[PDB]
Tab-separated table of C-alpha atoms in Angstrom:
chain	number	residue	atom	x	y	z
Z	3	UNK	CA	-40.931	-0.284	-0.559
Z	4	UNK	CA	-41.137	-3.760	-2.129
Z	5	UNK	CA	-37.346	-4.240	-2.069
Z	6	UNK	CA	-37.000	-3.279	1.597
Z	7	UNK	CA	-39.769	-5.625	2.771
Z	8	UNK	CA	-38.289	-8.524	0.777
Z	9	UNK	CA	-34.976	-7.962	2.554
Z	10	UNK	CA	-36.908	-7.881	5.820
Z	11	UNK	CA	-38.627	-11.131	4.838
Z	12	UNK	CA	-35.186	-12.677	4.266
Z	13	UNK	CA	-33.902	-11.760	7.701
Z	14	UNK	CA	-37.367	-12.409	9.143
Z	15	UNK	CA	-38.047	-15.505	7.008
Z	16	UNK	CA	-37.198	-19.195	6.990
Z	17	UNK	CA	-34.056	-20.848	5.655
Z	18	UNK	CA	-36.031	-22.456	2.827
Z	19	UNK	CA	-37.509	-19.035	1.987
Z	20	UNK	CA	-33.889	-17.884	1.608
Z	21	UNK	CA	-33.605	-20.198	-1.409
Z	22	UNK	CA	-36.120	-18.025	-3.303
Z	23	UNK	CA	-34.488	-14.765	-2.191
Z	24	UNK	CA	-32.042	-14.346	-5.090
Z	25	UNK	CA	-34.744	-15.214	-7.628
Z	26	UNK	CA	-37.336	-12.962	-5.978
Z	27	UNK	CA	-34.946	-10.011	-5.905
Z	28	UNK	CA	-34.103	-10.601	-9.571
Z	29	UNK	CA	-37.792	-10.786	-10.495
Z	30	UNK	CA	-38.566	-7.759	-8.333
Z	31	UNK	CA	-35.759	-5.711	-9.891
Z	32	UNK	CA	-36.662	-6.777	-13.450
Z	33	UNK	CA	-40.216	-5.575	-12.711
Z	34	UNK	CA	-38.909	-2.011	-12.282
Z	35	UNK	CA	-38.035	-1.912	-8.576
Z	36	UNK	CA	-35.939	0.969	-7.248
Z	37	UNK	CA	-32.709	-0.423	-5.722
Z	38	UNK	CA	-32.196	2.889	-3.888
Z	39	UNK	CA	-35.576	3.565	-2.213
Z	40	UNK	CA	-34.911	4.247	1.478
Z	41	UNK	CA	-37.434	3.821	4.273
Z	42	UNK	CA	-38.626	6.356	6.852
Z	43	UNK	CA	-35.329	6.216	8.776
Z	44	UNK	CA	-33.150	6.404	5.641
Z	45	UNK	CA	-32.017	2.762	5.468
Z	46	UNK	CA	-31.286	1.842	1.837
Z	47	UNK	CA	-31.616	-1.691	0.394
Z	48	UNK	CA	-27.822	-2.006	0.473
Z	49	UNK	CA	-27.647	-0.818	4.081
Z	50	UNK	CA	-30.417	-3.183	5.167
Z	51	UNK	CA	-28.701	-6.039	3.334
Z	52	UNK	CA	-25.422	-5.313	5.120
Z	53	UNK	CA	-27.443	-5.016	8.336
Z	54	UNK	CA	-28.815	-8.508	7.660
Z	55	UNK	CA	-25.246	-9.802	7.263
Z	56	UNK	CA	-24.279	-8.192	10.563
Z	57	UNK	CA	-27.109	-9.901	12.481
Z	58	UNK	CA	-27.852	-12.934	10.295
Z	59	UNK	CA	-26.920	-16.598	10.388
Z	60	UNK	CA	-24.163	-18.052	8.217
Z	61	UNK	CA	-26.839	-19.169	5.728
Z	62	UNK	CA	-28.164	-15.624	5.386
Z	63	UNK	CA	-24.540	-14.495	4.951
Z	64	UNK	CA	-23.618	-16.612	1.913
Z	65	UNK	CA	-26.905	-15.543	0.306
Z	66	UNK	CA	-26.102	-11.813	0.596
Z	67	UNK	CA	-23.163	-11.664	-1.860
Z	68	UNK	CA	-25.500	-12.456	-4.747
Z	69	UNK	CA	-28.151	-10.112	-3.358
Z	70	UNK	CA	-25.605	-7.287	-3.187
Z	71	UNK	CA	-24.306	-7.812	-6.732
Z	72	UNK	CA	-27.927	-7.816	-7.889
Z	73	UNK	CA	-28.578	-4.515	-6.101
Z	74	UNK	CA	-25.325	-2.996	-7.374
Z	75	UNK	CA	-25.976	-4.176	-10.942
Z	76	UNK	CA	-29.501	-2.732	-10.681
Z	77	UNK	CA	-27.898	0.664	-10.007
Z	78	UNK	CA	-27.710	1.050	-6.230
Z	79	UNK	CA	-25.628	4.009	-5.056
Z	80	UNK	CA	-22.734	2.521	-3.034
Z	81	UNK	CA	-22.157	5.874	-1.280
Z	82	UNK	CA	-25.699	6.535	-0.014
Z	83	UNK	CA	-25.454	6.694	3.776
Z	84	UNK	CA	-28.244	6.233	6.299
Z	85	UNK	CA	-29.690	9.023	8.444
Z	86	UNK	CA	-26.799	8.605	10.900
Z	87	UNK	CA	-24.326	9.172	8.062
Z	88	UNK	CA	-22.970	5.610	7.867
Z	89	UNK	CA	-21.817	4.613	4.389
Z	90	UNK	CA	-21.955	0.984	3.184
Z	91	UNK	CA	-18.152	0.810	3.308
Z	92	UNK	CA	-18.086	2.131	6.874
Z	93	UNK	CA	-20.813	-0.331	7.866
Z	94	UNK	CA	-18.855	-3.140	6.200
Z	95	UNK	CA	-15.749	-2.261	8.215
Z	96	UNK	CA	-17.864	-2.248	11.382
Z	97	UNK	CA	-18.929	-5.784	10.441
Z	98	UNK	CA	-15.243	-6.714	10.218
Z	99	UNK	CA	-14.423	-4.858	13.446
Z	100	UNK	CA	-17.084	-6.616	15.539
Z	101	UNK	CA	-17.904	-9.730	13.508
Z	102	UNK	CA	-16.989	-13.397	13.551
Z	103	UNK	CA	-14.210	-14.812	11.381
Z	104	UNK	CA	-16.852	-15.889	8.849
Z	105	UNK	CA	-18.320	-12.377	8.696
Z	106	UNK	CA	-14.805	-10.964	8.318
Z	107	UNK	CA	-14.105	-12.998	5.192
Z	108	UNK	CA	-17.461	-12.001	3.697
Z	109	UNK	CA	-17.249	-8.268	4.397
Z	110	UNK	CA	-13.767	-8.282	2.867
Z	111	UNK	CA	-15.212	-9.623	-0.393
Z	112	UNK	CA	-18.156	-7.227	-0.257
Z	113	UNK	CA	-15.792	-4.260	0.112
Z	114	UNK	CA	-14.138	-5.075	-3.214
Z	115	UNK	CA	-17.597	-5.181	-4.791
Z	116	UNK	CA	-18.372	-1.750	-3.342
Z	117	UNK	CA	-15.087	-0.262	-4.541
Z	118	UNK	CA	-15.747	-1.712	-7.990
Z	119	UNK	CA	-19.268	-0.250	-7.845
Z	120	UNK	CA	-17.672	3.161	-7.249
Z	121	UNK	CA	-17.616	3.659	-3.493
Z	122	UNK	CA	-15.721	6.745	-2.297
Z	123	UNK	CA	-12.721	5.552	-0.232
Z	124	UNK	CA	-12.532	8.923	1.561
Z	125	UNK	CA	-16.200	9.360	2.500
Z	126	UNK	CA	-16.390	9.625	6.296
Z	127	UNK	CA	-19.266	9.191	8.736
Z	128	UNK	CA	-20.916	11.857	10.928
Z	129	UNK	CA	-18.016	11.624	13.412
Z	130	UNK	CA	-15.476	12.147	10.609
Z	131	UNK	CA	-14.128	8.597	10.856
Z	132	UNK	CA	-12.738	7.693	7.446
Z	133	UNK	CA	-12.439	4.148	6.066
Z	134	UNK	CA	-8.679	4.368	6.675
Z	135	UNK	CA	-9.072	5.559	10.275
Z	136	UNK	CA	-11.517	2.752	11.066
Z	137	UNK	CA	-9.210	0.115	9.563
Z	138	UNK	CA	-6.409	1.411	11.788
Z	139	UNK	CA	-8.720	0.859	14.769
Z	140	UNK	CA	-9.224	-2.726	13.578
Z	141	UNK	CA	-5.451	-3.225	13.496
Z	142	UNK	CA	-4.876	-1.680	16.925
Z	143	UNK	CA	-7.619	-3.501	18.853
Z	144	UNK	CA	-8.451	-6.489	16.646
Z	145	UNK	CA	-7.384	-10.115	16.539
Z	146	UNK	CA	-4.343	-11.437	14.701
Z	147	UNK	CA	-6.690	-12.426	11.867
Z	148	UNK	CA	-8.238	-8.957	11.820
Z	149	UNK	CA	-4.786	-7.327	11.842
Z	150	UNK	CA	-3.705	-8.983	8.604
Z	151	UNK	CA	-7.085	-8.507	6.914
Z	152	UNK	CA	-7.445	-4.869	7.945
Z	153	UNK	CA	-3.854	-4.374	6.788
Z	154	UNK	CA	-4.472	-5.654	3.261
Z	155	UNK	CA	-7.795	-3.825	2.945
Z	156	UNK	CA	-6.055	-0.592	3.937
Z	157	UNK	CA	-3.539	-1.012	1.111
Z	158	UNK	CA	-6.490	-1.879	-1.119
Z	159	UNK	CA	-8.096	1.422	-0.151
Z	160	UNK	CA	-4.868	3.391	-0.605
Z	161	UNK	CA	-4.544	1.960	-4.121
Z	162	UNK	CA	-8.217	2.906	-4.638
Z	163	UNK	CA	-7.373	6.545	-3.843
Z	164	UNK	CA	-7.751	6.821	-0.064
Z	165	UNK	CA	-5.802	9.701	1.489
Z	166	UNK	CA	-3.787	8.581	4.538
Z	167	UNK	CA	-3.824	12.048	6.139
Z	168	UNK	CA	-7.531	12.852	6.632
Z	169	UNK	CA	-8.368	13.324	10.326
Z	170	UNK	CA	-11.643	12.767	12.181
Z	171	UNK	CA	-13.733	15.361	14.032
Z	172	UNK	CA	-11.353	15.179	17.017
Z	173	UNK	CA	-8.415	15.944	14.725
Z	174	UNK	CA	-6.963	12.437	15.085
Z	175	UNK	CA	-4.805	11.704	12.052
Z	176	UNK	CA	-3.943	8.199	10.829
Z	177	UNK	CA	-0.283	8.915	11.627
Z	178	UNK	CA	-1.212	9.770	15.228
Z	179	UNK	CA	-3.041	6.453	15.544
Z	180	UNK	CA	-0.138	4.565	13.931
Z	181	UNK	CA	2.186	5.901	16.629
Z	182	UNK	CA	-0.225	4.492	19.210
Z	183	UNK	CA	-0.184	1.099	17.479
Z	184	UNK	CA	3.616	1.205	17.564
Z	185	UNK	CA	3.889	2.271	21.196
Z	186	UNK	CA	1.564	-0.244	22.862
Z	187	UNK	CA	0.955	-2.875	20.187
Z	188	UNK	CA	2.169	-6.447	19.858
Z	189	UNK	CA	5.304	-7.449	17.966
Z	190	UNK	CA	3.168	-7.901	14.846
Z	191	UNK	CA	1.116	-4.756	15.448
Z	192	UNK	CA	4.259	-2.650	15.817
Z	193	UNK	CA	5.627	-4.121	12.589
Z	194	UNK	CA	2.437	-3.214	10.722
Z	195	UNK	CA	2.605	0.256	12.285
Z	196	UNK	CA	6.275	0.789	11.407
Z	197	UNK	CA	5.535	-0.242	7.813
Z	198	UNK	CA	2.638	2.194	7.469
Z	199	UNK	CA	4.570	4.922	9.283
Z	200	UNK	CA	7.478	4.606	6.836
Z	201	UNK	CA	5.109	4.599	3.858
Z	202	UNK	CA	3.414	7.759	5.144
Z	203	UNK	CA	6.693	9.505	6.020
Z	204	UNK	CA	7.904	9.146	2.428
Z	205	UNK	CA	4.749	10.366	0.655
Z	206	UNK	CA	2.948	12.335	3.381
Z	207	UNK	CA	3.974	15.831	2.343
Z	208	UNK	CA	2.875	14.902	-1.192
Z	209	UNK	CA	0.573	11.887	-1.559
Z	210	UNK	CA	0.305	11.069	-5.263
Z	211	UNK	CA	3.451	12.820	-6.508
Z	212	UNK	CA	4.682	9.451	-7.837
Z	213	UNK	CA	1.315	7.995	-8.954
Z	214	UNK	CA	2.341	8.368	-12.619
Q	2	UNK	CA	35.812	13.132	-17.870
Q	3	UNK	CA	32.629	15.203	-18.002
Q	4	UNK	CA	32.807	18.131	-15.524
Q	5	UNK	CA	29.841	16.734	-13.558
Q	6	UNK	CA	31.479	13.297	-13.443
Q	7	UNK	CA	34.845	14.814	-12.568
Q	8	UNK	CA	33.339	16.737	-9.636
Q	9	UNK	CA	31.611	13.604	-8.310
Q	10	UNK	CA	34.857	11.648	-8.660
Q	11	UNK	CA	36.632	14.277	-6.549
Q	12	UNK	CA	34.120	13.836	-3.702
Q	13	UNK	CA	34.540	10.093	-3.166
Q	14	UNK	CA	38.340	10.061	-3.556
Q	15	UNK	CA	38.864	13.380	-1.761
Q	16	UNK	CA	38.956	14.865	1.709
Q	17	UNK	CA	35.978	16.168	3.681
Q	18	UNK	CA	36.752	19.814	2.861
Q	19	UNK	CA	35.855	19.216	-0.803
Q	20	UNK	CA	32.505	17.730	0.260
Q	21	UNK	CA	31.045	20.785	2.022
Q	22	UNK	CA	31.080	23.148	-0.970
Q	23	UNK	CA	30.305	20.405	-3.502
Q	24	UNK	CA	26.542	20.983	-3.643
Q	25	UNK	CA	27.158	24.648	-4.472
Q	26	UNK	CA	29.781	23.688	-7.068
Q	27	UNK	CA	27.317	21.322	-8.762
Q	28	UNK	CA	24.566	23.962	-8.710
Q	29	UNK	CA	26.831	26.394	-10.558
Q	30	UNK	CA	28.039	23.673	-12.940
Q	31	UNK	CA	24.528	22.526	-13.870
Q	32	UNK	CA	23.346	26.130	-14.272
Q	33	UNK	CA	26.237	26.647	-16.720
Q	34	UNK	CA	24.568	24.148	-19.044
Q	35	UNK	CA	26.251	20.914	-17.976
Q	36	UNK	CA	24.551	17.737	-19.160
Q	37	UNK	CA	23.510	15.695	-16.086
Q	38	UNK	CA	23.321	12.491	-18.174
Q	39	UNK	CA	26.796	12.371	-19.770
Q	40	UNK	CA	28.233	8.908	-19.089
Q	41	UNK	CA	31.901	7.935	-19.158
Q	42	UNK	CA	33.616	5.115	-21.068
Q	43	UNK	CA	32.168	2.385	-18.811
Q	44	UNK	CA	28.622	3.744	-19.079
Q	45	UNK	CA	28.456	5.150	-15.543
Q	46	UNK	CA	26.062	8.094	-15.463
Q	47	UNK	CA	26.347	10.892	-12.877
Q	48	UNK	CA	23.398	9.324	-11.029
Q	49	UNK	CA	24.930	5.834	-11.108
Q	50	UNK	CA	28.277	7.203	-9.900
Q	51	UNK	CA	26.471	9.073	-7.115
Q	52	UNK	CA	24.777	5.847	-5.986
Q	53	UNK	CA	28.199	4.177	-6.063
Q	54	UNK	CA	29.424	6.896	-3.693
Q	55	UNK	CA	26.537	6.177	-1.300
Q	56	UNK	CA	27.276	2.447	-1.250
Q	57	UNK	CA	31.035	2.782	-0.667
Q	58	UNK	CA	31.316	6.223	0.942
Q	59	UNK	CA	31.406	7.465	4.498
Q	60	UNK	CA	28.258	8.663	6.236
Q	61	UNK	CA	29.330	12.239	5.457
Q	62	UNK	CA	29.527	11.457	1.742
Q	63	UNK	CA	26.177	9.670	1.968
Q	64	UNK	CA	23.943	12.488	3.231
Q	65	UNK	CA	25.702	14.913	0.874
Q	66	UNK	CA	24.869	12.741	-2.157
Q	67	UNK	CA	21.120	12.683	-1.409
Q	68	UNK	CA	21.019	16.444	-1.986
Q	69	UNK	CA	23.274	15.969	-5.019
Q	70	UNK	CA	20.752	13.512	-6.485
Q	71	UNK	CA	17.942	16.061	-6.155
Q	72	UNK	CA	20.095	18.576	-8.026
Q	73	UNK	CA	20.886	16.127	-10.839
Q	74	UNK	CA	17.267	15.023	-11.222
Q	75	UNK	CA	16.060	18.634	-11.271
Q	76	UNK	CA	18.643	19.334	-13.993
Q	77	UNK	CA	16.939	16.590	-15.995
Q	78	UNK	CA	18.874	13.422	-15.214
Q	79	UNK	CA	17.218	10.288	-16.561
Q	80	UNK	CA	16.080	8.144	-13.593
Q	81	UNK	CA	15.857	5.063	-15.859
Q	82	UNK	CA	19.344	5.132	-17.413
Q	83	UNK	CA	21.058	1.860	-16.453
Q	84	UNK	CA	24.752	0.992	-16.506
Q	85	UNK	CA	26.366	-1.306	-19.058
Q	86	UNK	CA	25.239	-4.334	-17.029
Q	87	UNK	CA	21.637	-3.137	-17.193
Q	88	UNK	CA	21.179	-2.182	-13.543
Q	89	UNK	CA	18.772	0.726	-13.196
Q	90	UNK	CA	19.140	3.335	-10.421
Q	91	UNK	CA	16.146	1.903	-8.539
Q	92	UNK	CA	17.540	-1.636	-8.776
Q	93	UNK	CA	20.977	-0.441	-7.666
Q	94	UNK	CA	19.366	1.419	-4.745
Q	95	UNK	CA	17.586	-1.722	-3.559
Q	96	UNK	CA	20.868	-3.635	-3.769
Q	97	UNK	CA	22.372	-0.936	-1.546
Q	98	UNK	CA	19.501	-1.509	0.899
Q	99	UNK	CA	19.909	-5.287	0.692
Q	100	UNK	CA	23.554	-5.163	1.803
Q	101	UNK	CA	23.840	-1.755	3.455
Q	102	UNK	CA	23.875	-0.435	6.976
Q	103	UNK	CA	20.776	0.847	8.702
Q	104	UNK	CA	22.049	4.347	7.896
Q	105	UNK	CA	22.430	3.505	4.201
Q	106	UNK	CA	18.974	1.900	4.232
Q	107	UNK	CA	17.336	5.040	5.622
Q	108	UNK	CA	19.139	7.147	3.032
Q	109	UNK	CA	18.350	4.930	0.033
Q	110	UNK	CA	14.632	4.977	0.871
Q	111	UNK	CA	14.594	8.751	0.343
Q	112	UNK	CA	16.443	8.463	-2.977
Q	113	UNK	CA	13.902	5.908	-4.218
Q	114	UNK	CA	11.084	8.387	-3.589
Q	115	UNK	CA	13.095	11.090	-5.368
Q	116	UNK	CA	13.640	8.761	-8.328
Q	117	UNK	CA	9.963	7.754	-8.462
Q	118	UNK	CA	8.850	11.397	-8.398
Q	119	UNK	CA	11.347	12.057	-11.183
Q	120	UNK	CA	9.524	9.416	-13.221
Q	121	UNK	CA	11.396	6.186	-12.581
Q	122	UNK	CA	9.816	3.075	-14.089
Q	123	UNK	CA	8.676	0.854	-11.178
Q	124	UNK	CA	8.613	-2.247	-13.405
Q	125	UNK	CA	11.956	-1.846	-15.190
Q	126	UNK	CA	13.975	-5.011	-14.545
Q	127	UNK	CA	17.674	-5.776	-14.789
Q	128	UNK	CA	19.337	-8.112	-17.305
Q	129	UNK	CA	18.278	-11.107	-15.187
Q	130	UNK	CA	14.619	-10.024	-15.295
Q	131	UNK	CA	14.565	-9.256	-11.575
Q	132	UNK	CA	11.981	-6.503	-11.014
Q	133	UNK	CA	12.039	-3.924	-8.194
Q	134	UNK	CA	9.153	-5.759	-6.522
Q	135	UNK	CA	10.870	-9.149	-6.755
Q	136	UNK	CA	14.067	-7.769	-5.227
Q	137	UNK	CA	12.168	-6.131	-2.366
Q	138	UNK	CA	10.589	-9.508	-1.593
Q	139	UNK	CA	14.100	-10.977	-1.435
Q	140	UNK	CA	15.036	-8.265	1.067
Q	141	UNK	CA	11.957	-9.201	3.107
Q	142	UNK	CA	12.755	-12.915	2.901
Q	143	UNK	CA	16.391	-12.821	4.022
Q	144	UNK	CA	16.858	-9.396	5.635
Q	145	UNK	CA	16.916	-7.991	9.143
Q	146	UNK	CA	13.813	-6.867	10.999
Q	147	UNK	CA	14.634	-3.294	10.005
Q	148	UNK	CA	15.127	-4.331	6.378
Q	149	UNK	CA	11.872	-6.316	6.516
Q	150	UNK	CA	9.809	-3.299	7.528
Q	151	UNK	CA	11.553	-0.870	5.164
Q	152	UNK	CA	11.435	-3.178	2.133
Q	153	UNK	CA	7.744	-3.688	2.918
Q	154	UNK	CA	6.885	0.017	2.829
Q	155	UNK	CA	9.033	0.516	-0.276
Q	156	UNK	CA	7.072	-2.304	-1.891
Q	157	UNK	CA	3.811	-0.505	-1.128
Q	158	UNK	CA	5.375	2.765	-2.291
Q	159	UNK	CA	6.219	1.029	-5.575
Q	160	UNK	CA	2.742	-0.482	-5.902
Q	161	UNK	CA	1.286	2.995	-5.408
Q	162	UNK	CA	3.606	4.146	-8.210
Q	163	UNK	CA	2.159	1.472	-10.515
Q	164	UNK	CA	4.325	-1.611	-9.984
Q	165	UNK	CA	2.828	-4.813	-11.376
Q	166	UNK	CA	2.806	-7.618	-8.762
Q	167	UNK	CA	2.611	-10.351	-11.408
Q	168	UNK	CA	5.792	-9.720	-13.409
Q	169	UNK	CA	8.117	-12.716	-13.151
Q	170	UNK	CA	11.871	-12.853	-13.621
Q	171	UNK	CA	13.736	-14.780	-16.333
Q	172	UNK	CA	13.365	-18.056	-14.387
Q	173	UNK	CA	9.593	-17.537	-14.343
Q	174	UNK	CA	9.523	-16.783	-10.601
Q	175	UNK	CA	6.472	-14.676	-9.771
Q	176	UNK	CA	6.179	-12.423	-6.699
Q	177	UNK	CA	3.295	-14.551	-5.417
Q	178	UNK	CA	5.541	-17.613	-5.751
Q	179	UNK	CA	8.175	-15.949	-3.580
Q	180	UNK	CA	5.584	-14.766	-1.031
Q	181	UNK	CA	4.436	-18.343	-0.443
Q	182	UNK	CA	8.049	-19.290	0.235
Q	183	UNK	CA	8.337	-16.450	2.762
Q	184	UNK	CA	5.172	-17.720	4.450
Q	185	UNK	CA	6.268	-21.354	4.705
Q	186	UNK	CA	9.719	-20.891	6.263
Q	187	UNK	CA	9.694	-17.284	7.527
Q	188	UNK	CA	9.563	-15.751	10.996
Q	189	UNK	CA	6.309	-14.770	12.699
Q	190	UNK	CA	6.728	-11.214	11.402
Q	191	UNK	CA	7.842	-12.298	7.923
Q	192	UNK	CA	4.839	-14.625	7.663
Q	193	UNK	CA	2.530	-11.743	8.577
Q	194	UNK	CA	3.992	-9.509	5.856
Q	195	UNK	CA	3.663	-12.365	3.364
Q	196	UNK	CA	0.052	-13.101	4.342
Q	197	UNK	CA	-0.796	-9.405	3.994
Q	198	UNK	CA	0.697	-9.174	0.510
Q	199	UNK	CA	-0.927	-12.477	-0.440
Q	200	UNK	CA	-4.369	-11.197	0.606
Q	201	UNK	CA	-3.840	-7.893	-1.202
Q	202	UNK	CA	-2.910	-9.641	-4.457
Q	203	UNK	CA	-5.826	-12.086	-4.354
Q	204	UNK	CA	-8.305	-9.220	-3.916
Q	205	UNK	CA	-6.962	-6.955	-6.693
């Protein structure tokens, strides 16, 4: 598909070629290009773009926010997962989980774009890992920068409608993971865990009973 | 005064034997058609008097009054009816947390959820314009480590209920303005809570 190869020519192109990437995508989309056409393995233009961010230079990174808004404005489905079952939001959080501090700041901004585009905050991957459960992993095993960022994004997801009780395939609930963060976490990790544990304990039996 | 108010008055200024059967007595009084909103001469509603009992009462009186609040709210007590000074039940609860024991703090957190489920306005301020969010940030700024964590989760519980994080008080002090102050001179844990709330606000 024309869109997918262009994205491949951005990752596999020069830095000066990157200058023409936003314009080329705009002229390709205006020409009637499908912003959702996946390739043989099911990678969508959004997923490949996030994949470029994950493996690209800082120059390729700053380019991708405009390329994502262009794809989202063109009508890309923000919930279309790849063949493995990885949603753009779950791939974004993996970029935060394993990325540099620069990638962390970017994927945080891209997540807001995806939520605005209409991404499902409860859509899990093939293993049942929800966006909330992955953010709790980022808090438990991430840096002090990742702790605060994953903390605010989790509240952002809860406000967006994420349910803090959905478990994964192994039956691991977010509350079970919060107890782990409290038991063996740092002074700051335990504080974040105690906050989230108190929030859950007061609206766990009925999440949304006061959302009026 | 009002039979509901008279019963509540007998609990705080009475012995412990009166307290055990009080929940049953209120259940039969409300079922008999007693108005759970009738205030006295000073404007104290049955809910506001019950919160006064929690703040000044023994631990026995405290856990009894949490069940008594559920009864009054189910009977149709207004969770937004403030006293003559203009202090709403949620704002009085937070003041109880701000100055109360760890036991009173744990109790008042459950009453806030009961009030919010009843339909309490999360943005209703007092006469001074202090909003529930702004007061919770004060509890975070100058409270204990236990009060820090609890006021934090109550702040998120209020945001989930629809609290606006941009409402300022009468002096024009915004919640973001207070969060920066917590970050500049707060502890390592207070600064983390402030940085979290600052990132959340800037992103939505």
